[PDB]
Design a protein around this motif. Structure first.
Motif, PDB file in Angstrom:
ATOM      1  N   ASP A   1      -4.174  -2.079  18.778  1.00  0.00           N
ATOM      2  CA  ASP A   1      -4.213  -3.332  19.510  1.00  0.00           C
ATOM      3  C   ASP A   1      -5.098  -4.355  18.778  1.00  0.00           C
ATOM      4  OD1 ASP A   1      -6.915  -3.076  21.115  1.00  0.00           O
ATOM      5  OD2 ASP A   1      -5.799  -1.177  21.453  1.00  0.00           O
ATOM      6  N   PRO A   2      -4.832  -5.638  19.008  1.00  0.00           N
ATOM      7  CA  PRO A   2      -5.533  -6.766  18.398  1.00  0.00           C
ATOM      8  C   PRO A   2      -6.950  -6.624  17.827  1.00  0.00           C
ATOM      9  CG  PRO A   2      -4.799  -7.205  20.674  1.00  0.00           C
ATOM     10  CD  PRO A   2      -3.967  -6.112  20.098  1.00  0.00           C
ATOM     11  N   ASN A   3      -7.866  -5.972  18.541  1.00  0.00           N
ATOM     12  CA  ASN A   3      -9.213  -5.875  18.004  1.00  0.00           C
ATOM     13  C   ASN A   3      -9.373  -4.914  16.834  1.00  0.00           C
ATOM     14  OD1 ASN A   3     -11.436  -6.971  20.751  1.00  0.00           O
ATOM     15  ND2 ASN A   3     -10.098  -8.048  19.294  1.00  0.00           N
ATOM     16  N   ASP A   4      -8.350  -4.111  16.589  1.00  0.00           N
ATOM     17  CA  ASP A   4      -8.350  -3.204  15.454  1.00  0.00           C
ATOM     18  C   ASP A   4      -7.591  -3.793  14.260  1.00  0.00           C
ATOM     19  OD1 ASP A   4      -9.665  -1.026  16.820  1.00  0.00           O
ATOM     20  OD2 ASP A   4      -7.801  -0.913  18.002  1.00  0.00           O
ATOM     21  N   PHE A   5      -6.845  -4.872  14.484  1.00  0.00           N
ATOM     22  CA  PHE A   5      -6.079  -5.489  13.403  1.00  0.00           C
ATOM     23  C   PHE A   5      -7.016  -6.052  12.348  1.00  0.00           C
ATOM     24  CE2 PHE A   5      -2.639  -4.581  15.728  1.00  0.00           C
ATOM     25  CZ  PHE A   5      -2.063  -5.544  16.559  1.00  0.00           C
ATOM     26  N   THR A   6      -6.650  -5.871  11.097  1.00  0.00           N
ATOM     27  CA  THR A   6      -7.482  -6.401  10.059  1.00  0.00           C
ATOM     28  C   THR A   6      -7.243  -7.888   9.799  1.00  0.00           C
ATOM     29  OG1 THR A   6      -5.908  -5.697   8.397  1.00  0.00           O
ATOM     30  CG2 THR A   6      -7.606  -4.168   9.030  1.00  0.00           C
ATOM     31  N   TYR A   7      -7.342  -8.728  10.826  1.00  0.00           N
ATOM     32  CA  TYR A   7      -7.194 -10.165  10.585  1.00  0.00           C
ATOM     33  C   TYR A   7      -8.465 -10.613   9.831  1.00  0.00           C
ATOM     34  CZ  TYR A   7      -3.861 -10.485  14.696  1.00  0.00           C
ATOM     35  OH  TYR A   7      -2.814 -10.346  15.593  1.00  0.00           O
ATOM     36  N   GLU A   8      -8.472 -11.865   9.389  1.00  0.00           N
ATOM     37  CA  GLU A   8      -9.633 -12.447   8.733  1.00  0.00           C
ATOM     38  C   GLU A   8     -10.547 -12.771   9.924  1.00  0.00           C
ATOM     39  OE1 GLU A   8     -10.963 -12.777   5.845  1.00  0.00           O
ATOM     40  OE2 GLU A   8     -12.568 -13.644   7.074  1.00  0.00           O
TER      41      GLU A   8
ATOM     42  N   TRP B   1       8.380   0.939   1.392  1.00  0.00           N
ATOM     43  CA  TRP B   1       7.471   0.490   0.339  1.00  0.00           C
ATOM     44  C   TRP B   1       7.685   1.431  -0.822  1.00  0.00           C
ATOM     45  CZ3 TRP B   1       1.930  -0.552   2.677  1.00  0.00           C
ATOM     46  CH2 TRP B   1       2.069  -1.107   3.970  1.00  0.00           C
ATOM     47  N   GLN B   2       7.088   1.112  -1.957  1.00  0.00           N
ATOM     48  CA  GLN B   2       7.256   1.975  -3.105  1.00  0.00           C
ATOM     49  C   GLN B   2       5.897   2.429  -3.633  1.00  0.00           C
ATOM     50  OE1 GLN B   2      10.705   1.790  -6.603  1.00  0.00           O
ATOM     51  NE2 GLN B   2       9.657  -0.039  -5.823  1.00  0.00           N
ATOM     52  N   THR B   3       5.047   1.455  -3.979  1.00  0.00           N
ATOM     53  CA  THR B   3       3.655   1.711  -4.531  1.00  0.00           C
ATOM     54  C   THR B   3       3.124   0.307  -4.391  1.00  0.00           C
ATOM     55  OG1 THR B   3       4.309   3.419  -6.066  1.00  0.00           O
ATOM     56  CG2 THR B   3       2.131   2.239  -6.480  1.00  0.00           C
ATOM     57  N   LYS B   4       2.121  -0.236  -5.119  1.00  0.00           N
ATOM     58  CA  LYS B   4       1.812  -1.587  -4.537  1.00  0.00           C
ATOM     59  C   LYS B   4       0.552  -2.277  -5.046  1.00  0.00           C
ATOM     60  N   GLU B   5      -0.098  -3.075  -4.140  1.00  0.00           N
ATOM     61  CA  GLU B   5      -1.437  -3.708  -4.540  1.00  0.00           C
ATOM     62  C   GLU B   5      -2.486  -3.196  -3.529  1.00  0.00           C
ATOM     63  OE1 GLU B   5      -3.623  -4.509  -5.295  1.00  0.00           O
ATOM     64  OE2 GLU B   5      -2.940  -5.066  -7.451  1.00  0.00           O
ATOM     65  N   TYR B   6      -2.625  -4.031  -2.526  1.00  0.00           N
ATOM     66  CA  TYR B   6      -3.526  -3.495  -1.483  1.00  0.00           C
ATOM     67  C   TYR B   6      -3.055  -4.539  -0.576  1.00  0.00           C
ATOM     68  CZ  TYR B   6      -5.514   0.620  -3.232  1.00  0.00           C
ATOM     69  OH  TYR B   6      -5.432   1.974  -3.894  1.00  0.00           O
ATOM     70  N   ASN B   7      -2.345  -3.899   0.370  1.00  0.00           N
ATOM     71  CA  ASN B   7      -1.658  -4.355   1.547  1.00  0.00           C
ATOM     72  C   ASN B   7      -2.587  -3.566   2.506  1.00  0.00           C
ATOM     73  OD1 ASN B   7       0.848  -2.553  -0.234  1.00  0.00           O
ATOM     74  ND2 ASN B   7       0.721  -4.813  -0.431  1.00  0.00           N
ATOM     75  N   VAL B   8      -2.627  -3.940   3.787  1.00  0.00           N
ATOM     76  CA  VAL B   8      -3.480  -3.266   4.778  1.00  0.00           C
ATOM     77  C   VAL B   8      -2.980  -1.910   5.263  1.00  0.00           C
ATOM     78  CG1 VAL B   8      -4.856  -3.580   6.840  1.00  0.00           C
ATOM     79  CG2 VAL B   8      -3.850  -5.567   5.684  1.00  0.00           C
ATOM     80  N   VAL B   9      -3.542  -0.843   4.708  1.00  0.00           N
ATOM     81  CA  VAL B   9      -3.199   0.514   5.117  1.00  0.00           C
ATOM     82  C   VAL B   9      -4.446   0.999   5.879  1.00  0.00           C
ATOM     83  CG1 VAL B   9      -3.511   0.879   2.586  1.00  0.00           C
ATOM     84  CG2 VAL B   9      -3.221   2.866   4.079  1.00  0.00           C
ATOM     85  N   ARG B  10      -4.377   2.157   6.512  1.00  0.00           N
ATOM     86  CA  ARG B  10      -5.570   2.652   7.183  1.00  0.00           C
ATOM     87  C   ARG B  10      -6.266   3.565   6.142  1.00  0.00           C
ATOM     88  NH1 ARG B  10      -5.217   4.658  12.750  1.00  0.00           N
ATOM     89  NH2 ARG B  10      -4.545   3.017  14.213  1.00  0.00           N
ATOM     90  N   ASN B  11      -6.419   3.044   4.906  1.00  0.00           N
ATOM     91  CA  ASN B  11      -7.046   3.772   3.780  1.00  0.00           C
ATOM     92  C   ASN B  11      -8.567   3.542   3.591  1.00  0.00           C
ATOM     93  OD1 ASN B  11      -6.240   1.077   2.368  1.00  0.00           O
ATOM     94  ND2 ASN B  11      -7.105   2.167   0.582  1.00  0.00           N
TER      95      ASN B  11
END
Ligand SMILES: O=c1ccn([C@@H]2O[C@H](COP(=O)(O)O)[C@@H](O)[C@H]2O)c(=O)[nH]1
Ligand SMILES: [Mn+2]
Length: 287
Positions: free
Chosen positions: A174-181, A276-286
Motif C-alpha cells: 500500500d501507498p506508504n510502502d511505495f518507493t515514491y520520491e 523483464w529480462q535484466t536491466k538497470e535499477y528499476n524498483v525491486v524489493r532488493n
C-alpha cells in the motif's frame, strides 16, 4: 465514440484482484477482456498503433533484437503498427524481418553519458517526435523499455486515453510502502499520506496528445530537479508516478503485462504478455 466499458470488460471473471479504480478506470487482467470484439471495433476504425523504444550503447546488442522480434510477433497483431527505434549507433542496429501490418523507422540520437540521463532524456525526445510526426501517424502510442520481451498477445485490450502499468513488485503493497520520491525538494515529491498505486515506467501509453503531456510534464520536472541539484530516487519513474497521481490513467494494466519472473509465479499472474529480462535499477524489493 460508440464503445462502452461493459462491451468488452467484465470485472467478475477476476474477483480476487483489483479490477476497477475509485475513479472508475479498469485494470486489465487476463480473463476480464474480450479481444475478439475489440479487434473488430478497432480494425473498422482503421486504428494504427505506435511503439517507441530506445537502445543506446551495449543495450543494442543485448536487447534490441529480442525486443523487436517479440514485438513483431505479439504486439497488436492484426492492426497496423509502427516501431520508432531510437539508437545512438544506427550501424549496429539489428534488422529483423517484420510481418504483415508492421513497419518502422530509426532515428539516431545523442547518447548521454550517465545512464540516468539516458533514461530521463527519453522524455524530451519522445515529446519532440510526437509533435514532429507521431501525432499525425498513429492513434495510440506506447513507450517501452528495450530490456523486456513479449511472451504473449499484447493487444487492443490495452488501448486507452492514458495507460499505466502496475509495477510487478509492488501491486499488493500500500501507498506508504511505495518507493515514491519523498524529499519535498524534488518535483517528483509525493507526500506520505497520498498515492493510488505504484506505476512501472517500463510501459506507458495513450493517445499521442496524452503521451505528449505525460512526457512534457515529466521532463520539465526532471529539469527543475537538476536546477535544484537533486535527482529523484527512481528518476523518470518517480516523475511518472507524481504525474499519474495528479492525472489518473484512464486505464491501468495488470502485472501480467510486465511481469518479472524473479518474483516467481503467483496465482494472480494468469498469462504473462510481457516479462523483464535484466536491466538497470528499476524498483525491486532488493538490496
Ligand atoms: O545504457 C542504457 C540505459 C538505458 N537505456 C534505455 O532506457 C531504458 C531504461 O531502463 P533501465 O536501464 O532503467 O533498466 C532502457 O530499457 C533502454 O530503452 C539504454 O538504451 N541504454
Ligand atoms: Mn528496464
Amino acid at each position: 465514440s460508440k464503445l462502452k466499458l461493459s462491451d468488452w470488460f467484465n470485472p467478475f471473471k477476476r474477483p480476487e484482484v483489483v479490477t476497477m479504480t475509485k475513479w472508475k478506470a479498469p485494470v486489465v487482467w487476463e480473463g476480464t477482456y474480450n479481444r475478439a470484439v475489440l479487434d473488430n471495433y478497432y480494425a473498422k476504425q482503421k486504428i494504427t498503433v505506435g511503439l517507441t523504444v530506445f537502445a543506446v550503447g551495449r543495450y543494442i546488442e543485448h536487447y534490441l533484437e529480442e525486443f523487436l522480434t517479440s514485438a513483431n510477433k505479439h504486439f497488436m497483431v492484426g492492426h497496423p503498427v509502427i516501431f520508432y527505434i531510437m539508437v545512438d549507433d544506427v550501424s549496429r542496429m539489428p534488422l529483423i524481418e517484420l510481418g504483415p501490418l508492421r513497419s518502422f523507422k530509426v532515428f539516431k540520437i545523442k547518447p548521454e553519458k550517465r545512464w540516468q540521463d539516458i533514461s530521463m532524456m527519453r522524455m524530451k525526445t519522445i515529446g519532440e517526435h510526437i509533435v514532429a510526426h507521431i501525432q499525425h501517424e498513429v492513434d495510440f502510442l506506447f513507450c517501452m523499455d528495450v530490456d523486456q520481451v513479449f511472451q504473449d498477445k499484447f493487444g487492443v485490450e490495452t488501448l486507452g486515453e492514458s495507460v499505466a502499468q502496475l509495477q510487478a513488485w509492488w501491486y499488493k503493497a500500500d501507498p506508504n510502502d511505495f518507493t515514491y520520491e519523498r524529499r519535498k525538494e524534488s518535483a517528483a515529491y509525493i507526500p506520505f499520506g497520498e498515492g493510488d498505486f505504484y506505476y512501472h515506467a517500463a510501459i506507458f501509453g495513450g493517445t499521442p496528445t496524452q503521451v505528449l503531456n505525460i512526457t512534457q510534464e515529466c521532463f520539465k520536472g526532471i529539469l527543475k530537479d537538476k536546477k535544484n541539484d537533486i535527482e529523484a530516487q527512481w528518476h523518470d519513474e518517480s516523475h511518472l508516478n507524481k504525474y499519474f497521481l495528479l492525472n489518473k490513467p484512464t486505464k491501468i494494466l495488470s502485472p501480467e503485462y510486465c511481469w518479472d519472473y524473479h518474483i516467481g509465479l503467483p496465482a494472480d499472474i494468469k498469462l504473462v504478455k510481457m516479462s523483464w529480462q535484466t536491466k538497470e535499477y528499476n524498483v525491486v524489493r532488493n538490496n
